[PDB]
Symmetry: D2
């Protein structure tokens, strides 16, 4: 019906075969790409660094340079989209996820399944040694009118000073075609910053986004 004002997320799955589950609510601004979110565990203490859930934890808040993003258009007309993300880490770990949304006016309900495996017991994720996520640029292309393929190199800083790297690849599938003005402008880049304050069981997340085809 309209652009998003609020949202809620049920995020669940497993890391190294041990189940996790978090729920919570959030808000954001569709005019500038800002979004905020609180999450609490429903199954006790998290076994892994909560930073590994960034960027898992809402592009319906992202505007484009000259109008609505395809994500925003898909929310307004109700046809929507599905997300499918893969992340391969330097130390052999793999993190795959799928996002499903439903829309109630200006409210979004997220159901995000997230499966992580192969994270070494002594690596930065399982030892809670991640400190921050690097600022990041995503490259988006449109191989057809109902598909976005997004790529970025994702890196955390760790307590040792070494970075922890992964190669991210995200596919968006739309039920209806994206508008002609979106498809004409390829590639579309998105710069993003994130912040996360976390405990063993709870986290508060913030994101800022800016889309651009050109910086000159």
């Amino acid at each position: 019906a309209s652009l998003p004002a609020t949202h809620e997320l049920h995020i669940f799955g497993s890391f190294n075969g041990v189940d996790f589950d978090m729920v919570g609510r959030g808000t954001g601004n569709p005019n500038d790409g800002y979004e905020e979110l609180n999450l609490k565990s429903t199954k006790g203490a998290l076994q892994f660094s909560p930073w590994i859930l960034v960027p898992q934890i809402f592009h319906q808040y992202l505007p484009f340079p000259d109008g609505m993003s395809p994500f925003q258009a898909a929310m307004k007309d109700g046809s929507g989209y599905q997300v499918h993300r893969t992340m391969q880490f330097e130390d052999g770990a793999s993190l795959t996820s799928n996002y499903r949304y439903t829309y109630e006016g200006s409210h979004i309900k997220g159901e995000f399944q997230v499966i992580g495996t192969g994270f070494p017991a002594d690596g930065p994720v399982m030892t809670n040694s991640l400190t921050a996520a690097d600022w990041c640029v995503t490259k988006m292309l449109y191989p057809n009118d109902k598909t976005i393929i997004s790529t970025f190199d994702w890196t955390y800083t760790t307590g040792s000073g070494k970075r922890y790297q992964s190669t991210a690849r995200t596919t968006y599938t739309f039920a209806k075609p994206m508008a002609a003005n979106i498809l004409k402008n390829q590639p579309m880049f998105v710069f993003r910053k994130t912040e996360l304050k976390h405990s063993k069981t709870e986290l508060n997340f913030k994101e800022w986004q800016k889309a651009f085809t050109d910086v000159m």
Copy 2:
């Protein structure tokens, strides 16, 4: 009643390019030589994609090792079991991720497989139903710790045009209890496999042969 498997059943489901699919069926196998065969039928009408893309998605509990039980077999016997997480990244940009869960009762396996595929082009061999066969394949397995197997292979199909359709496969196995020392000593462990698939748009018959080895010579 602990045993190696004689029969299995599968519920396999998920989506390809945002379109849901669901199949169910039953199979048998020989855990002395890695043979298995499976019949599946669709529960949501005709499949929108090449049934070959469900191989190798569609049971390593049938695989023996050269010196004795595989960790897959050992985890079935004692009932502690394992989970499977597979990622396949295709040459044309498509991605196929999946997650396998099992339950056991004696010599019978019940499989619940979730499979999500996206980014398969409209004119690619998956969506045009142009995959003709799966190449015979060698998997490499390593054990980074006593409860994890990392499996890698280069997965290729033949197509109608003669061009092969390629993907890079990575599979993680996560066990509830430690694998035995006789398993962990032999690294890398390689597995040579062959597959056959007869299919319509609603039904398929799958066969697989397997042979594990550390040394060809």
Copy 3:
């Protein structure tokens, strides 16, 4: 002494594509205050049997300024210690393109020796059929795992005559003889937005590049 940011450069670029040798030589200029470069190259061994677009971005980061001052490439030229470049590119159709760049400096002038080896480009692919029409505008990500190394990554795509893009994954390692300055090392990651243009025949090309480094667009 003549320690300087670059005004001019020359390039000898050579190696092979699908086992057939090629060799080009030429001269160029640029503006190290805004990242602009222009380069003219001519073949010394006949017609190029591959799309000249496959030599982008092979065909000078000494022209790139950073937002707050010199880039490490500029600083390495200014003091003469310099750097080596090692680039790998893996293409969607299974082709492989690896290269190594060596430089010498005389004041504001750069001499480049670039070795470039391409293999596995299919006979009916867009490179060997001269079907590449342009290179997409592109954002590179740079990180510094130590004081003498830069690791760079980008997803590199061309438009083609068929209408569908030709993709590769690019990874570049820069190795510096002396440590990079602390102010450079503090600002990570450093992104670089770039545009390119290429006019070409089978034996000659005119290349243009525009660059803009940034840690933040907001």
Copy 4:
């Protein structure tokens, strides 16, 4: 014009921008794939683990199950082939190389250029922590009559107990078309074992090879 009995190698290039150069002589058996090689450094002590020159340091010794490999056939008629190898390591290092050959009867002369970068100072290569190369299966496909694409996951055991991994990819380009009996029989696998006895300045290398399409 002959199958190989002996060979010599000049291997050179750099690791992390530092030049290296080795020369030496070897023998092998073209009827079973065995080859042995001894090399000496010409620029003093090597600054890296000599294990990182495996598998860099002669498929002209490899037979196929139905006769000559394409590598053997290319030597026997003199048309030959070029090799182009890329290896991407788990800690961010890259190793690329190019091999050229000339033939003098049953004697091969190899000129191999090897460039390695991004090997961290505390990684297994630069600390000399590699203990052995894992036994390995290569997969070979022929996308056309003059090209072979070789893939393998390459791992060393180390002194820490953790393996050191890379993803290896090799392209062979032939001057003449390979024979029909090769092109139809895809994929071709090759199982190999290696042994290395090394010092800072000298090494003895051994390799055993076996090509197969089916082990049932």
